[PDB]
Design a protein around this ligand. Sequence first.
Ligand SMILES: [Mn+2]
Ligand SMILES: [Mn+2]
Lengths: 431, 429
Amino acid sequence: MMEKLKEIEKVTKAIKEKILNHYGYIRVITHHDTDGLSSGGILAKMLMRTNKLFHLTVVEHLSKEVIEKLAKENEVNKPLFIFADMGSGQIEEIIKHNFNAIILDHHPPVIKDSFINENIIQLNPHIFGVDGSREITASGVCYLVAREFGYYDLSVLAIVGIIGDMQYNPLLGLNKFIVNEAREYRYVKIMNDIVYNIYDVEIYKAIAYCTKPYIPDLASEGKAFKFLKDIGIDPNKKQLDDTDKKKLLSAIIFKYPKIENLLIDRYLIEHKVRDAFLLSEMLNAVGRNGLFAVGIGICLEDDECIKIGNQILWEYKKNLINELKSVKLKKLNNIYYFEGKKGMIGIIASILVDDKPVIGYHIEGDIAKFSARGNRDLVNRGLNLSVAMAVAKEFGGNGGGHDVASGAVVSKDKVQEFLKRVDEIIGEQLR
Amino acid sequence: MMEKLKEIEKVTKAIKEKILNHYGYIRVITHHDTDGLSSGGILAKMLMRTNKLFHLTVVEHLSKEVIEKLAKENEVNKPLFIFADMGSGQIEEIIKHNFNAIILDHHPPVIKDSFINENIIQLNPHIFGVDGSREITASGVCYLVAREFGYYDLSVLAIVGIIGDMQYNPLLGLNKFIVNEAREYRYVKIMNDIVYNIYDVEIYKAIAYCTKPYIPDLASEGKAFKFLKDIGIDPNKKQLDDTDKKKLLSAIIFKYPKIENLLIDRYLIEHKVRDAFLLSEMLNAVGRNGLFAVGIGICLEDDECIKIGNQILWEYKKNLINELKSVKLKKLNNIYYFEGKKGMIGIIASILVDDKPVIGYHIEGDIAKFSARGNRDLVNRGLNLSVAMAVAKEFGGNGGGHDVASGAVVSKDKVQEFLKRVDEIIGEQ
Ligand SMILES: [Mn+2]
Ligand SMILES: [Mn+2]
């Protein structure tokens, strides 16, 4: 592991020198999810500290259209471009326009090279045989650059990206090294705890609006209040102690049996938002609402951006519970499915997964677009959603993805027939 | 005085709405002194809080060449330009290239209109009869916009700008409104104290490197250490109590009865750099060292930028003391002048100013850049260095600023252009 870092240091040192020796404009382009906003915040601090002024933009997708602007800014003052949480998938277009560019990304690379020509450096873990889907995120990649300047305090934002991208359980590889370094330097403390304690609000509200896990029977202030009163816990306290947690867990297993999902390693970070899980949810909610610059402000610990983030998070959480309660969940033999709204199908399907895969879809043109979600126990028993969603090219469509999460597209009149086929495939995968 | 705010608030509400309704790129341009960097920090926090991404650049002078650049950025994606601590004098060039712009400035305006055309809003307090040299700074103008959003916490950076532009004594007009609003919202507390206690270092170092007041007989660690041990004060302590204060005051006033400003009204602000006087000096030092992004970072309370800022401040103050010893004051008819190094010219001028204006300069390539300072005593008798230094037009350049402090540039005719300035200063006297 010290040897893999030694191979990565060759690329991070070159990136450091490229930034230090550049004196023109610097453009930072990052993504709007939690990992992208955290990357933006790491880069903003690192650049300010090295005396670089910069123009930071947050985009939703690095399309051909987006890259073809930007290239218009190249014509006079050819800036140094730093792409974060994107860039590897689109590297051909970036080479095409001859950007002076640094790419910090963990998406599977199209070109598996760290040095592309004389003007492009690509830092992507897959090039060193690190699995970017489980062992490092974009914010960790930006952090590997920052630590060449000795900015170990920025490790707290790398951890936020680890949570946002669901790479915290298990904690593997470079991610595990990053957390250990942060703990050694005392920027993070690690504490096993119950998930409701991360919110620092009234516990009955923490339970009412939780979606990790979502417990339908408890998903309202009234039912959560009553449940806590019954087992003798003060519903208005803001942290459950050890006695409260034993009583809660003993009682809740009857409404939600997989109570291991209620226990997590909490990360208490050196940041004004001290709970990394809470900061991750805040950045998500702010990014989903288009408040990109507020999200950067939160990473930079601005009081007012944090106050906006708190207000937006709880509106986001209340609205998500409302959306969840409006789902008309329909059951086949081995799956559930539902029709919902274009924006949140996959978000809703992942939250709804309990014992069987969940497939959501929305109708667009004549198209119908599906999002399929499973869990780890489902995969261990033999689920593979990309094989089952591939059957879309049997009904004049297309489908695929990962074993635990896949999509598909299939003409609007084949919905029932496509789902029957998917249901039967999954049934057989699990025997 | 509350009536003059009502007139300003019509321009700050229009600025607020112009920023809110803009969804393209935003360019912020400020200067590198304490007032410009503080304005950059105010605008950075204000813009982020209103969900605006932006590109900030710091220039030392808003030259015609700089304006022609920047203007090339309007060809595709026409940004909204926010000019802070600049733009009012250059207004005709900004109009000429048809920027979408907001101008936040306290220099004497060229056009005395708030609402120039369809595209430009100029917020300049001179237009409402506020004295931009004694009653408000660029920081305070930026803060007047920010308070339209309720961002009262940003008053701490306006206070830093007030100090950096030497408008804290006396504290007048809009600057006094801002300080009292800050104290009312509990973002500042005011405390009368000896100047040397603002540094939180060993007193013999706080004295040796102090330049307000500058005491040449004590401007070394050696003599400062000995002066304190001879009057009963432990020179290694970092804060002076009342007894050591009265002992140091009378000992200093005895041997130097002309000395002034040993007791100041300290401003303790809600900021990681709690002493606004120290924050002012720190921003000046990093700005003079070209560390523009670090200074913004310091305003935004980044721990590492503050660390750099402390290290750079003390290197700078030591460089400054060495240069005050070796500087060569020279007399003419009605000005003093000198040559020196880039980051020291304006500050040495104002430390030395006593009986007549001082103009420093440094040669940077083919050009000489000047810094003229008077006092409020000399503008009382009609100085205005902005009229005096504008005669660089006669020498292939330009000039301007405030009545009490101005600059000028070009070229190798320093001596010829110097004494065309001592001329005006007696026609003005
Ligand atoms: Mn990611
Ligand atoms: Mn100023």
